Amino acid sequence: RLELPVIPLRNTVILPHTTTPVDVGRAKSKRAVEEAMGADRLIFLVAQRDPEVDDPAPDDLYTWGVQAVVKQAMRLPDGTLQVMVEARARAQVTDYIPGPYLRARGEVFSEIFPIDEAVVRVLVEELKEAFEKYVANHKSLRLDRYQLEAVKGTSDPAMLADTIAYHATWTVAEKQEILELTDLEARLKKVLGLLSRDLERFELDKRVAQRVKEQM
Amino acid sequence: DTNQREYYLREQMKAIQKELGGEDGLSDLEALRKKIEEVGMPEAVKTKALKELDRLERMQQGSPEATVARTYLDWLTEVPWSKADPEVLDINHTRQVLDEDHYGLKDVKERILEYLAVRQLTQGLDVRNKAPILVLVGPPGVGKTSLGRSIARSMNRKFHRISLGGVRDEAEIRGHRRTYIGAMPGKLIHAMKQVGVINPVILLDEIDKMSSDWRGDPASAMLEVLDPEQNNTFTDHYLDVPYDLSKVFFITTANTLQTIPRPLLDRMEVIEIPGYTNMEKQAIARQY
Amino acid sequence: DTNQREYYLREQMKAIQKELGGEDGLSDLEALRKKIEEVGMPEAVKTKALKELDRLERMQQGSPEATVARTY
Amino acid sequence: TSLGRSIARSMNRKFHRISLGGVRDEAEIRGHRRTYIGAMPGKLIHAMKQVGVINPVILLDEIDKMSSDWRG
Amino acid sequence: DTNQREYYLREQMKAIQKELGGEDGLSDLEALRKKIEEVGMPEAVKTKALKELDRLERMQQGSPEATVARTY
Amino acid sequence: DTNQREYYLREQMKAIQKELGGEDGLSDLEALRKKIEEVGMPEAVKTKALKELDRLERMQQGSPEATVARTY
Amino acid sequence: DTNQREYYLREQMKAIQKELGGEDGLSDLEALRKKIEEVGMPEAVKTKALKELDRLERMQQGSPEATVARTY
Amino acid sequence: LWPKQVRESGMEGRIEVTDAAILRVISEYTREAGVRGLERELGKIARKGAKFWLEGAWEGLRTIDASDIPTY
């Protein structure tokens, strides 16, 4: 809501309920960063992969989005703008004006907490077991896993899917899809199928590796 | 998910094969491998493409192994399978096209009308031939390529020449073992590689002057090709699955009715090509 | 060190042309393998078939043993 | 080659002459295979690059002496 | 030990073989990167030149594919 | 100094070339090619002679006429 | 002692050829080597049988000196 | 023969060939010690029949006799 300059993400993935530093150094987007922080500290984030330009193009952005209310007002126009913002509720895309600047509405800025908890924490515990067995095969591709174990009290399933879906790197663009999705059960079963194909190709890699050692 | 992993392994083999091998056509090799599923081609052909696909992944030298695999994929996806010209169903339209060639002289053009009149009357719930290709014979300048040109107009097909003067080997007919580069098929697979249809015409040239004087008989493989179902089982030394050469129409030019090899004197029908009159030739130099 | 890496990756070539060869390296090998265990033939001739059986499960660009053995 | 020099002058162009005598292969007619360094093109490309105009004159010497042993 | 020695001999072969001359200088890349654009080729020849222009600039002396592309 | 470094290099070239089966032992078709060029003859002799050098290497020497060509 | 040594070669070579390409050599090498030294034979047989006992343990395709040995 | 020839052309139910016709054929168009010449001549009748029918159907029943001979 409250139409903003739009910050085209192609190198930073924010978290709901957690601060994340934004790294924008592109010339036609850092002016949007400055004007959005001057827009009562509200930043509108839509990713792109349609060919990477510094323009807020309506043809390069998707129809999915996420909000960002700013938690630290700092800009550094001598390089990459160091600013730490936070999402508390994700959004979608409603408007398209050819930029600069693209003026668009997201959604409201508020906290979301789950109503049901039983099937919610069942699928949360399945997803946490899936990450904790995947991160064992991700030991060669090392990423620290204490970052999930300190946020276990947050029982928001879409936020934890935004966390674990961030804590596994299969494709940044599909992580931009999941990070901007409205639906939670869709992104949860999506991350389950992704950990499925990941651990299955891990085991195929072990099969080929033993095949190679035996051929040796 | 499993296909994500399998085509992920294909992306791994692309990532490795753009690091080693003969690589100025190896992305082209990757396109032809992609063109396996894109050229409509049979499942025996798709399976021999699985064979050469498991002969791919040349994670070794650019020494001929990657190159010969590229050539195999080339000769796969560029000799057309499953693509064809919509033929004419008429000898009346064919006569309409032969109204224009050299006037057609009304001697052999009616013979071609006979042979197509029975073959626009193809019955047996198929297209059986059990028949020759109706070979031709005359001096070389007269309208060999021209008459075959007009017939390819008539069917709305294409016409093409491959030659056999001074050929003596089935090694010149069939290719060899693709185990080094410089291995190619013989002529005929390239002649098909020229057109983009599984129903073209081929004009065999001067075949009575294919005189075998080394190992192998070319006349053997050629009487195999001339047989109307053995062509459908015909393959060379370079290739695995025989190309369906029953859907392909043929025609042949020679000059001598006596130095033709002997099993080729069956499965044949001679039409002796004329040595034209002055007045018709004059009319051609006037009008065309 | 280079040719070491070269052998490493052409082993990857062979094992990834394999892809869990219980199916097979290419699946038609166990389709002609069952012509051993499903065709009624004499014991010495099927015995040299069973001795050729242990030499099976090879590709084409790798070992060309089943290349002749299937035909045999 | 006298005739050729005055051809290029009389065309106001550039004359260049190379030999195709004794050629057996696509080594000097076409280039060598692209899988190695030490592939160098046909002599025709040499005649192109060594001369400077889009409309040159190329002379091919001893063309009755080109035959086949390998590379077609 | 003897076959390991014959191995070592056949690689000392190539190590001596790459001696006697060495390539340096890296302003030739800037020169040819100009002369692609500074020799106005048609879209056939400018397309193949832009291909070699995109292929290079990672190595042009190293891998055996970019060396013959550099001479190309 | 250039001749001396190339002398070190050709030194080790002959050192490795020695211990590799003696340059194919100077095999038969090598020396047959030699002897025609090792005797000074009229030139068309050398022509038809390297011709018949190339006319071999395709039979099995059970051939009762190409062997007569080897005699010639 | 020579017969005990040929027994040891007879045992070890069939124990290994029974697992390998000696299955394509059918392991009749050290089965018919039992006819060399493990049947009461004259010294004519022992002499010829040594002359083709040395021809044991061979390659099995391409003019084999193993099959004609066991036949001998 | 003639059922195979109407199987070759495809004039099934179209053709009446009587047998004075066959007498005229063997007495005039084949003098050999076989059946092959009868295949050839009845093939000529079959082809000329397919021509006369696809240009236009005059009837459904076509009497070939000893009087329509040099037309087929």
Residue numbers in the entry:
A (entry chain B): 2 to 217
B (entry chain E): 218 to 505
C (entry chain D), E (entry chain F), F (entry chain A), G (entry chain C): 218 to 289
D (entry chain F): 362 to 433
H (entry chain D): 506 to 577
Quote the original article.
To provide a comparative context, we also examined wild-type MtaLon in two states: without any nucleotide (MtaLon-Apo) and incubated with 5 mM ADP (MtaLon:ADP). Unexpectedly, both MtaLon-Y224S:ATPγS and wild-type MtaLon, whether with ADP or lacking nucleotide, predominantly formed left-handed spiral pentamers or spiral hexamers, rather than closed-ring hexamers. The substrate-free hexameric form also adopts a left-handed spiral structure. It is composed of the tethered pentamer and an additional Ac-protomer, Ac6*, which binds next to the protomer Ob1 and occupies the lowermost position of the spiral. Interestingly, the 3H subdomain of Ac6* occupies the axial cavity of the spiral complex and binds to the ATPase domains of the protomers 1–5, effectively blocking the accessibility of the pore loops and forming an inactive structure.
The Lon protease is a AAA+ protein found in prokaryotes, archaea, and eukaryotic organelles. Lon is involved in cellular protein homeostasis by degrading damaged or misfolded abnormal proteins, which prevents these unwanted protein species from forming toxic aggregates. Lon is known to form a homohexamer; each protomer is composed of multiple domains, including an N-terminal substrate-binding globular domain (NGD), a long-helix domain (LH), a three-helix bundle (3H), a AAA+ ATPase module, and a protease domain. We show here, using cryo-electron microscopy (cryo-EM), that the activation process of the Lon AAA+ protease may involve a pentameric assembly and a substrate-dependent incorporation of the sixth protomer to form the substrate-pore-loop contacts seen in the translocating state.
